[PDB]
Design a protein around this motif. Structure first.
Motif, mmCIF file in Angstrom:
data_model
loop_
_atom_site.group_PDB
_atom_site.id
_atom_site.type_symbol
_atom_site.label_atom_id
_atom_site.label_comp_id
_atom_site.label_asym_id
_atom_site.label_seq_id
_atom_site.Cartn_x
_atom_site.Cartn_y
_atom_site.Cartn_z
ATOM 1 N N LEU A 195 0.815 -1.205 0.000
ATOM 2 C CA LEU A 195 0.000 0.000 0.000
ATOM 3 C C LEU A 195 0.846 1.252 0.000
ATOM 4 C CD1 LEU A 195 -3.132 -0.237 2.250
ATOM 5 C CD2 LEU A 195 -3.002 0.217 -0.205
ATOM 6 N N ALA A 196 1.852 1.266 0.871
ATOM 7 C CA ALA A 196 2.755 2.396 1.002
ATOM 8 C C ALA A 196 3.622 2.563 -0.247
ATOM 9 C CB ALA A 196 3.625 2.229 2.247
ATOM 10 N N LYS A 197 3.992 1.463 -0.892
ATOM 11 C CA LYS A 197 4.704 1.614 -2.158
ATOM 12 C C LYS A 197 3.774 2.222 -3.218
ATOM 13 C CE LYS A 197 8.038 -2.214 -1.693
ATOM 14 N N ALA A 198 2.539 1.736 -3.270
ATOM 15 C CA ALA A 198 1.597 2.232 -4.262
ATOM 16 C C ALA A 198 1.359 3.733 -4.049
ATOM 17 C CB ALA A 198 0.273 1.448 -4.192
ATOM 18 N N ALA A 199 1.140 4.099 -2.786
ATOM 19 C CA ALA A 199 0.896 5.476 -2.374
ATOM 20 C C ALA A 199 2.063 6.359 -2.774
ATOM 21 C CB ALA A 199 0.668 5.545 -0.884
ATOM 22 N N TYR A 200 3.263 5.880 -2.468
ATOM 23 C CA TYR A 200 4.483 6.568 -2.855
ATOM 24 C C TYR A 200 4.556 6.808 -4.370
ATOM 25 C CZ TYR A 200 9.467 7.168 -3.825
ATOM 26 O OH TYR A 200 10.685 7.609 -4.304
ATOM 27 N N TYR A 201 4.326 5.752 -5.142
ATOM 28 C CA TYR A 201 4.502 5.801 -6.588
ATOM 29 C C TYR A 201 3.437 6.602 -7.292
ATOM 30 C CZ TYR A 201 8.270 2.388 -6.703
ATOM 31 O OH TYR A 201 9.480 1.737 -6.553
ATOM 32 N N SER A 202 2.298 6.803 -6.642
ATOM 33 C CA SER A 202 1.233 7.555 -7.286
ATOM 34 C C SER A 202 0.971 8.904 -6.620
ATOM 35 C CB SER A 202 -0.056 6.745 -7.301
ATOM 36 O OG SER A 202 -0.458 6.445 -5.984
ATOM 37 N N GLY A 203 1.726 9.232 -5.581
ATOM 38 C CA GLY A 203 1.605 10.533 -4.965
ATOM 39 C C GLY A 203 0.356 10.714 -4.129
ATOM 40 N N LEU A 224 -0.479 -1.750 -6.883
ATOM 41 C CA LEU A 224 0.950 -1.520 -6.825
ATOM 42 C C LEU A 224 1.536 -1.572 -8.233
ATOM 43 C CD1 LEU A 224 3.797 -1.197 -5.660
ATOM 44 C CD2 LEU A 224 3.659 -3.612 -4.966
ATOM 45 N N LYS A 225 1.207 -2.631 -8.965
ATOM 46 C CA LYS A 225 1.707 -2.761 -10.323
ATOM 47 C C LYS A 225 1.320 -1.538 -11.164
ATOM 48 N N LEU A 226 0.075 -1.089 -10.991
ATOM 49 C CA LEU A 226 -0.451 0.005 -11.794
ATOM 50 C C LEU A 226 0.310 1.270 -11.491
ATOM 51 C CD1 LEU A 226 -4.315 0.313 -12.224
ATOM 52 C CD2 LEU A 226 -2.559 0.603 -13.961
ATOM 53 N N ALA A 227 0.537 1.520 -10.208
ATOM 54 C CA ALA A 227 1.171 2.749 -9.761
ATOM 55 C C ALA A 227 2.638 2.787 -10.175
ATOM 56 C CB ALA A 227 1.029 2.900 -8.261
ATOM 57 N N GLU A 228 3.332 1.659 -10.072
ATOM 58 C CA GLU A 228 4.678 1.597 -10.616
ATOM 59 C C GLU A 228 4.656 1.900 -12.123
ATOM 60 O OE1 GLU A 228 7.740 -1.051 -9.617
ATOM 61 O OE2 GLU A 228 6.510 -2.156 -8.147
ATOM 62 N N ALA A 229 3.692 1.283 -12.811
ATOM 63 C CA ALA A 229 3.539 1.483 -14.244
ATOM 64 C C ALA A 229 3.323 2.963 -14.570
ATOM 65 C CB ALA A 229 2.389 0.640 -14.786
ATOM 66 N N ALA A 230 2.485 3.639 -13.798
ATOM 67 C CA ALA A 230 2.139 5.021 -14.085
ATOM 68 C C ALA A 230 3.316 5.921 -13.747
ATOM 69 C CB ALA A 230 0.896 5.433 -13.306
ATOM 70 N N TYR A 231 4.022 5.571 -12.678
ATOM 71 C CA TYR A 231 5.211 6.290 -12.271
ATOM 72 C C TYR A 231 6.268 6.273 -13.372
ATOM 73 C CZ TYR A 231 9.157 7.861 -9.488
ATOM 74 O OH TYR A 231 10.224 8.572 -8.992
ATOM 75 N N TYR A 232 6.511 5.109 -13.962
ATOM 76 C CA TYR A 232 7.508 5.024 -15.026
ATOM 77 C C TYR A 232 6.977 5.564 -16.346
ATOM 78 C CZ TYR A 232 10.816 2.269 -12.298
ATOM 79 O OH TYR A 232 11.749 1.853 -11.372
ATOM 80 N N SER A 233 5.676 5.442 -16.547
ATOM 81 C CA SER A 233 5.057 5.838 -17.795
ATOM 82 C C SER A 233 4.843 7.350 -17.827
ATOM 83 C CB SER A 233 3.734 5.097 -17.972
ATOM 84 O OG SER A 233 3.062 5.494 -19.148
ATOM 85 N N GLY A 248 -4.124 -3.989 -25.298
ATOM 86 C CA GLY A 248 -4.514 -5.375 -25.107
ATOM 87 C C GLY A 248 -3.560 -6.181 -24.237
ATOM 88 N N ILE A 249 -2.934 -5.526 -23.266
ATOM 89 C CA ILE A 249 -1.953 -6.214 -22.434
ATOM 90 C C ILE A 249 -2.346 -6.209 -20.965
ATOM 91 C CG2 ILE A 249 -0.056 -5.800 -24.030
ATOM 92 C CD1 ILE A 249 0.802 -3.400 -22.538
ATOM 93 N N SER A 250 -1.768 -7.120 -20.188
ATOM 94 C CA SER A 250 -2.014 -7.157 -18.752
ATOM 95 C C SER A 250 -1.246 -6.045 -18.068
ATOM 96 C CB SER A 250 -1.611 -8.497 -18.152
ATOM 97 O OG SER A 250 -0.212 -8.579 -18.029
ATOM 98 N N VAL A 251 -1.539 -5.810 -16.798
ATOM 99 C CA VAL A 251 -0.902 -4.726 -16.073
ATOM 100 C C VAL A 251 0.574 -5.055 -15.839
ATOM 101 C CG1 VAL A 251 -0.756 -3.631 -13.784
ATOM 102 C CG2 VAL A 251 -2.907 -3.691 -14.994
ATOM 103 N N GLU A 252 0.872 -6.336 -15.617
ATOM 104 C CA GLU A 252 2.253 -6.790 -15.421
ATOM 105 C C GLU A 252 3.092 -6.452 -16.644
ATOM 106 O OE1 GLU A 252 3.888 -7.582 -13.000
ATOM 107 O OE2 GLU A 252 5.523 -8.976 -13.480
ATOM 108 N N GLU A 253 2.523 -6.799 -17.794
ATOM 109 C CA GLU A 253 3.052 -6.480 -19.114
ATOM 110 C C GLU A 253 3.342 -4.990 -19.260
ATOM 111 O OE1 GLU A 253 3.906 -8.832 -21.000
ATOM 112 O OE2 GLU A 253 3.273 -8.587 -23.109
ATOM 113 N N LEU A 254 2.356 -4.169 -18.927
ATOM 114 C CA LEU A 254 2.473 -2.716 -19.012
ATOM 115 C C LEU A 254 3.578 -2.144 -18.116
ATOM 116 C CD1 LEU A 254 1.508 0.120 -19.834
ATOM 117 C CD2 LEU A 254 -0.046 -0.064 -17.863
ATOM 118 N N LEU A 255 3.700 -2.711 -16.923
ATOM 119 C CA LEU A 255 4.752 -2.335 -15.996
ATOM 120 C C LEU A 255 6.107 -2.623 -16.636
ATOM 121 C CD1 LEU A 255 6.011 -1.570 -13.260
ATOM 122 C CD2 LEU A 255 5.709 -3.976 -12.597
#
Length: 278
Positions: A195-203, A224-233, A248-255
């Motif tokens: 949760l704290a990683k997700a919070a960190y990565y998405s502000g 978490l995966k999404l927020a890391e993805a958005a952070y890098y994206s 057409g990809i999974s969130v893991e894929e997107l990350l």
């Protein structure tokens, strides 16, 4: 090539100091695989050398590239030369894996490697245990001895204390606050960490991350995966998800793609297109 491949390739380019294309060419020149090249490029990075030199070094020493990587990292964290790292694994009767764990321990805890050894012996603990304490100390702004005592006086295992410390560090709170937050939300310390990683990565705050994951109808792992993805994206959580759908990809894929685009210096749509092209 697969997105996992593209990632390895990108990370290898980045650490090599090359274009992606040139990373491929270098893998050819050395007759090495891409995983190989990556490990070798990190080895070079940590030990101060060119990749070609690190290859030659592995050959000359008669050791695998994984082993060269571990040695290199050890030298890095201990602040020594690669050969010196060998001489230190000797003067201690220690396996190179063990030396690496030890050197990272010294690094996080602000000691010499020899001190970190002596401390593991004093406390009566294993090296890997020492490492966990060093990281917990580091994340929580205390000493190794204090962290040891703390795992005891909170009635927790060192592993749990580490998780709590990383969580506190990412959410910007005390360890005690971290745990009370985990109880409040009625959640696991592991869950709290994610949760704290997700919070960190998405502000956002942790309580906001919790609510977000509910209001998107996803798991915290997925958030978490999404927020890391958005952070890098360079995007928001919602944009990132729409994007995962749009390609057409999974969130893991997107990350993985987002990391790849990050390391190779491209947008995510480009990185995708590149994987398909290759």
């Amino acid at each position: 090539i697969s997105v996992e491949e593209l990632l390895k390739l990108a990370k290898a380019a980045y650490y090599s100091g090359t274009t992606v294309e040139e990373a491929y060419k270098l893998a050819l020149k050395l007759g090495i695989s891409v995983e190989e090249l990556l490990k070798l490029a990190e080895a070079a990075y940590y030990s101060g050398t060119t990749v070609e030199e690190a290859y030659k070094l592995a050959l000359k020493l008669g050791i695998s590239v994984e082993e060269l990587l571990k040695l290199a990292k050890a030298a890095y964290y201990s602040g020594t030369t690669v050969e010196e790292a060998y001489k230190l694994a000797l003067k201690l009767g220690i396996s190179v894996e063990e030396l690496l764990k030890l050197a990272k321990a010294a690094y996080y805890s602000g000691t010499t490697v020899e001190e970190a050894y002596k401390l593991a012996l004093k406390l009566g603990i294993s090296v890997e245990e020492l490492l966990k304490l060093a990281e917990a100390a580091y994340y929580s702004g205390t000493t190794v001895e204090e962290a040891y005592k703390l795992a005891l006086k909170l009635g927790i295992s060192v592993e749990e204390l580490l998780k709590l410390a990383k969580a506190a560090y990412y959410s910007g709170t005390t360890v005690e606050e971290a745990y009370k937050l985990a109880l409040k939300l009625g959640i696991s310390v592991e869950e709290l960490l994610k949760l704290a990683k997700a919070a960190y990565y998405s502000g956002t705050t942790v309580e906001e991350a919790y609510k977000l994951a509910l209001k998107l109808g996803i798991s915290v792992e997925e958030l978490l995966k999404l927020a890391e993805a958005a952070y890098y994206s360079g995007t928001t959580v919602e944009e990132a998800y729409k994007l995962a759908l749009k390609l057409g990809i999974s969130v893991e894929e997107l990350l993985k793609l987002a990391k790849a685009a990050y390391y190779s210096g491209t947008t995510v749509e480009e990185a995708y297109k590149l994987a398909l092209k290759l």
